[PDB]
Amino acid sequence: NVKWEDVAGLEGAKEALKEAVILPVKFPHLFKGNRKPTSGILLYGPPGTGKSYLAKAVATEANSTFFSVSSSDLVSGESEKLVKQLFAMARENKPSIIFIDEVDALTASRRIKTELLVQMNGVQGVLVLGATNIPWQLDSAIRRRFERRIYIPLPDLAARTTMFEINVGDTPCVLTKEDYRTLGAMTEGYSGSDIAVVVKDALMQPIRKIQSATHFKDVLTPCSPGDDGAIEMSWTDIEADELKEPDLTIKDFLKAIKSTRPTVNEDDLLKQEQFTRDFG
Amino acid sequence: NVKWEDVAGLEGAKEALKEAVILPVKFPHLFKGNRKPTSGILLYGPPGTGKSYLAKAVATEANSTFFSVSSSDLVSGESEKLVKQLFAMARENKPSIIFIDEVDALTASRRIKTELLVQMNGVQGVLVLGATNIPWQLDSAIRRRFERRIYIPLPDLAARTTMFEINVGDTPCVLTKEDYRTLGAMTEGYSGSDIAVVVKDALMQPIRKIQSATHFKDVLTPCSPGDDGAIEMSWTDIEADELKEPDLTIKDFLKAIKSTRPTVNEDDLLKQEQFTRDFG
């Protein structure tokens, strides 16, 4: 989905991972003696910043193998062994990152928490990135297991532009280069993923219009009851190859943006600012 | 444990894997169109030939990630998910081999068998090597899932020599270069691993002698009741630093070989010769 080449956005973070994650793996011989590399990296920050993609992104650049697992899908009879296998394989596989998403949800589970903490116990070769959107509620112990904390904030007033370019890839449209910028500008305060939902919505407009319509203009494409060829009929009547879906446009996206007020609570985001000052 | 560099032994097999496993991964662009690479490789042959090491060996050379799992340890509440995760990770990780040891033991298990067959279902990127010491008892279906069969026979009248060199590495001794050859020669018909057991035994001799002894000669090291300094006493009396363990020697190994008659049944091995003629 995302390539290191375009992950830049995050200010003082793309960098950190380069140094924190890549630099060691990119020739670790510089880490002999009292120069111990980094054991664990916690990624924490406002929800919907792709932390997951970011992790896979850095890992790929780092040319290490990638093993993710969500705490959610792990806490929710014998999953204690999954964690064993997981580290196991990461262990038995060159340089490897283990991405543990939603570490905060570690605290039918204390077994897992323990298991992990054990598997993390001791551990070069295998990095462990942990993700958390609620870093305070991470267990005192667990938090201790992650040395280098790295903050990953909401998308850059320009990073969004690309993302609009993303969740439309295949999907045909008519957006110009600028238009994405605009759409990026119009989403000040929006979550990198808040985006993707609006774009889902945006995409559905063309067909969504074909449905609720009364008249269709000729060239057939929907239209108003007053127009040059406005024939009162339905899409049901339109030929299998006589239907020209209306084009996608900023309009559509802007309508979406309009009706998709972003999730990130300014007061919430401030609270994460406290963790940075406590464990940054 | 084993490096591709020395795996040669197997006649017309080191080769096959190079071509069967490595050649595709070593630039797969040569496999466009009706040129489909190999889906699954069954390794079958007389027990104790390191098939497991061989698999890891080829995979390493192939520069793919390696994921093993034993059917034994998988058939013996919710392990159905392990297989999912396993392929899952192999899937999400570049070129990768999945090694399924003891496929024969696939036929509380039919769930697994199915699961696997499903996961194998369809599948470039991910090879699957399967190992079996009893290839006939592999399920008709399962066997169908492995296209290229590769036979891996008992060790070469000279391959053994190295292995004797192996299971002694750290362990100090006095074996010359020749002596290993000898030990290799003296194990005609021995299993690559039948070796390792004898060597366990061989290794224990030095201390094993220190124990059962009556007199110790000076320099202290054990000896006969008639000798130049044969003092009637025990190892219990010997000083913490006044004990010279007797040296390891061919003698010891040859005693072992003597008392460690190999497991591979000539008649059994013939039976595997039938599978080669039926599905080779």
Swiss-Prot record, chains A, B:
Region of the whole protein represented: 129 to 433 of 437
Source organism of the structure: Saccharomyces cerevisiae (strain ATCC 204508 / S288c)
Extra information: Present with 5350 molecules/cell in log phase SD medium.
Domain of life assignment: Eukaryota
Composition-biased stretches (Basic and acidic residues): 268-280
Biological-process GO terms, alphabetical: autophagosome maturation; autophagy; endosomal transport; intralumenal vesicle formation; late endosome to lysosome transport via multivesicular body sorting pathway; late endosome to vacuole transport; late endosome to vacuole transport via multivesicular body sorting pathway; macroautophagy
Keyword Transport on entry: yes
Family: Belongs to the AAA ATPase family.
Name of the molecule in the record: Vacuolar protein sorting-associated protein 4
Annotated Gene Ontology cellular component terms: ATPase complex; cytoplasm; endoplasmic reticulum; endosome; ESCRT IV complex; membrane; midbody; nuclear pore
Region of interest: Disordered: 265-280
